[PDB]
Each structure stands twice: as C-alpha cells, then as structure tokens.
C-alpha cells in the first residue's frame, strides 16, 4: 500500500523554530526505520522507549514527528529528564517518552553571513512548559517589578531571542536540525508498520 512520508519530514527544505516546533501526523503507511538508522549522517540518534532494530517489526496507531532547529549547546536537552532553556520554555519530552530523537548539524543550510535571524527560542517564560505544549505568545516579558506597557525596555524584555546563526560560529552555537519521533498506542488499529 502506502509509504510513510518520513523523507518529507527529514529532508524538508524549511524547518520551524523551537518555540513553534512543527509536529506532523504520520499514519496509514509503512516506513523503514532500519534505513533511517543506516544513515550514519545523523550526529545524534537516541531512542528512548524502543529499539532501533525492532522498529521495522512494530505497528502503532499514530506516529508523530516534530521538527525544529536549536544549537548544539542545546542538543543535549532534547531528552527526557532534561532541564534547560529549551527543555523548560520551548519543547519538553515527558518521562514515559517512547520514541527517537534525531538531529544533525545544519550549518551549511541554516546560517548566513549577515546573521540568519529567523530561528528563535523562548528565553523568558513565567513557568515551565508542560510536555509537548506549544507556546506562541509574544507578550513582552517582565523580569523586574516595574510593568511593561507592552513595549521593551530595561527589565521588560521581548520573550523571543533570535539565534544569531553565522557559519563562522563555534560548534555549540551552530544550528542543529532536529526530528523527534513519538510512537502512540491506543485502542484504534495500527497504521504505521514495517
């Protein structure tokens, strides 16, 4: 029958910023998970509930794939149990997470000489994200007790700090593209197999 459009998710030309991570629903298809592993062009490949071998031998009700961009300093946080700028205020994975986390260095595609100022994370937030919650607010945050009147100024900062992607950057401050595969099981029949 059908193939899973995992090639559309990974090899897509546009990725989103972390705060507005793009999630896509993969269903009614069959994809090769051994073949994803047999890349060896991914710098990070960690799976959390599942074996990357036993994935071709499985079926799930829904497969979810979230795609964003972070820096390398931050890649260690796309994991259960992680606390951080990203792990708290941008994109958080629960502690029962079964899935894979895949990320590679996209400095050739995702940075510019003048500054690629188009990817952003949420530096400032009142509380931590719930797992898999999305915050798209652009309210002007408040750090000190003086209010903000919706404009930026000292101790009233804009919540979204642009990554300053230049290629000359060091490894940690280079863009890493990321895709998280979560695998759901519910009473509904299986739709993504091997």
């Amino acid at each position, epitope marked *: 029958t059908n193939l899973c459009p995992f090639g559309e998710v990974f090899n897509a030309t546009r990725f989103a910023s972390v705060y507005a991570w793009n999630r896509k629903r993969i269903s009614n298809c069959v994809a090769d998970y051994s073949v994803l592993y047999n890349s060896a062009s991914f710098s990070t490949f960690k799976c959390y509930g599942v074996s990357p071998t036993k994935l071709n031998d499985l079926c799930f009700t829904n497969v979810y794939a979230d795609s964003f961009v972070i820096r390398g300093d931050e890649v260690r946080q796309i994991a259960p149990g992680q606390t951080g700028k990203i792990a708290d205020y941008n994109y958080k994975l629960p502690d029962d997470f079964t899935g894979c986390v895949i990320a590679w260095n996209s400095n050739n595609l995702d940075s510019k000489v003048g*500054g690629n100022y188009n990817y*952003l994370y949420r530096l400032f937030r009142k509380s931590n994200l719930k797992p898999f919650e999305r915050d798209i607010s652009t309210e002007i945050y408040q750090a000190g007790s*003086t209010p903000c*009147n919706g404009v*930026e100024g*000292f101790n009233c900062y804009f919540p979204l700090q*642009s990554y*300053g992607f*230049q290629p000359t950057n060091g490894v940690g401050y280079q863009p890493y593209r990321v895709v998280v595969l979560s695998f759901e099981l519910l009473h509904a029949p299986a739709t993504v197999c091997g």
Partner: antibody
Amino acid sequence: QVQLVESGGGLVKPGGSLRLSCAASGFTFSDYYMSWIRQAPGKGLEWVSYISSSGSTIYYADSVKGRFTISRDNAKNSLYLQMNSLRAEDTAVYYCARDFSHQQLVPSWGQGTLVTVSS
Amino acid sequence: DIQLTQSPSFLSASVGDRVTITCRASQGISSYLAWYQQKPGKAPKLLIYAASTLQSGVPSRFSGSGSGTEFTLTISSLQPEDFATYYCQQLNSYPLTFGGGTKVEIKR
C-alpha cells in the same frame, strides 16, 4: 576598554542614501541592546531606532520609520544604520550607544558622525 | 513616549558651588535613569546610571538620587571643567526619551 567607534557619515545629496557603522570593542556586544540617536546642531537628543540584543526585535522613530533600516552583525561586533531618502531636516550628528545588557543598565556612546544633507 | 521634564534650562554658578538639577518623568520609571554630561559637539559621557550609581572614573562630587518620578543630579563642589549641558535619559520603555538638558556656566 569599552569603546564604540562610529564611522561613515558626511555630505549626502538630498534624496540619496548613506550607511553608518559602529565598531564595537571592549565588551560582550551580543549581550547589549543598541540604539541610534541623532542630535541636530545645538538641539536636543533625538532617539531614532533600536535593535534587540539578538536582533529579534526592532523599532524606529516615527521621524524615520520605513525610511531608515537598522541592523546588527554579531560576529563582527558592528551595528549598522542604512539611511534612505535623506531630507533637509535629517542633518545631524548621529550617535550609536549601548543601551543595556540583560544585567548591566550601563549606557555608553560613540564619537558621532556629521551627516550633512544638502546639495 | 515617556516625557522627561528637566530644570533648570540654564544655571550659572561659581566654583565650589553646589549645582542641583531635577528631572521629572511623566510616569513611574522606578530608577531606570542615567545622567550624562555633554561638552560642546562631543559625545554625551556617562556620569550616573540606575538613578544613583556613579560610573567608574566620574569624580565623586557628582551624585544621583531618586526613584519613580523625581530625580536629581548634584555637583557638591562645581569645577571650572564642569561647563557643559547635562541631560537625563529614561530607560524604562522605548523610545528612549531625554530630558531638556541643563546648560551650566562658570562664574568668575
């Protein structure tokens, strides 16, 4: 030695354009907001525009909105102002200035440049 | 668009006199203010910031005070080399607004 060296400036045939450049040394420039403030001959300080520490955010005065384009490069620590459709009134000395880090509310200014818009 | 109202426009004093300048903000700005001293045609220089705290290298005679609406700059013993125009700057909300500016004369 915190210092903002400004450069460019000078006599612009009205209607033309000029670029203004601000070479930053002495601090972690990528931490600080930045601003372009001009001062007509023997008149007040007019703030004109700013750019967030990340370049995420940007606003312009109504006196220059749409007309001027502010920018920052954060590897070369400079801050740039592209001034288009210059007027008689736009004649001023132009100053760049660090406004504040997330943590040190400590301004500092550059030496200025005489943008002199006439024919 | 916080307006700054600074007095006097022009003060004249003799050496060793105590010049006192007031800047009042059109809304609460709770210590987000700096004080500069601008000799003619020269860059403004920082003297006080955070309403009260004295920049390194600024003679101790200069001093700031205030929080909210009323702010003062004080030269406890004026000097022949303080002839300038003195501005306050509001940092609470952009656009950054400045005070009128106070010229200072030395009487001899």
